[PDB]
Amino acid sequence: EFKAGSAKKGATLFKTRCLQCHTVEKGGPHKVGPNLHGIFGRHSGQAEGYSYTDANIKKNVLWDENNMSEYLTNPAKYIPGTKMAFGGLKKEKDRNDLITYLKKASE
Ligand code: HEC
Numbered sequence: 001e002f003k004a005g006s007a008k009k010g011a012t013l014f015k016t017r018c019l020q021c022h023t024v025e026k027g028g029p030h031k032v033g034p035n036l037h038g039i040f041g042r043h044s045g046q047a048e049g050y051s052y053t054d055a056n057i058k059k060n061v062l063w064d065e066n067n068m069s070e071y072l073t074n075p076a077k078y079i080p081g082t083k084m085a086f087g088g089l090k091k092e093k094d095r096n097d098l099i100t101y102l103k104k105a106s107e
Contacts, residue, residue, distance in 0.1 A: 002065035003096050010101025013094055021084065024105045032084065036106050039063055044079070055081035065103070069095045 014024070021032040028035040034047035041064070045057030059079045061067055071078040072095055076085040089095050 002069050002099055005093065005096035005100045007097070007101045007104055009094075010097035010099065011105070013089070013098045014101055014105070017086075017089060017098075021086070024102065036102065039106050040065070040068070040103055053079075053081055053083050055079050065099050068099060068102075072098070 022034070022036050023029055023031055024036045026037045028037065030047070030050045034050040034052070036047075039047075042062065044059045044061045044063065045052040056079055061071075067078075069092075072089045074088040075082050089098060
């Protein structure tokens with residue numbers, strides 16, 4: 001259950017845990033994983049110009065703060081077969097902080 005946290009702390013988490021694989025700016029490149037602009041309020045597997053695993057598309061989840069928190073804890077548990085699956089963001093406070101940042105940065 002997402003609770004708004006610190007966008008400042010979330011930005012640092014994004015830099016150290018996500019940026020190696022993702023950009024978030026509008027128009028940013030799909031460097032490894034997809035650019036994340038517009039991710040909230042959108043179905044999984046829909047970024048224009050990115051070939052996802054079929055698994056990520058067929059999960060058929062419409063992203064919100066709560067299901068993204070579950071996903072980020074362990075992506076392969078939520079979407080079996082997802083590619084380049086990172087290790088997960090384990091602490092609830094860290095997920096809350098990251099999602100607080102990502103909601104802003106991705107809009
Ligand atoms: C590379 C080793 C990654 C790290 C580190 C993180 N992510 Fe990731 N992400 C990666 C890939 C290759 C993909 C696509 C997977 C597929 O099976 O096709 C993803 C996907 C996501 C998604 C879903 C995107 C969508 O449905 O359009 C999100 C929301 C996401 N990633 C977020 C995210 C965040 C916030 C990270 C750090 C905590 C993180 N990613 C790390 C590859 C990699």
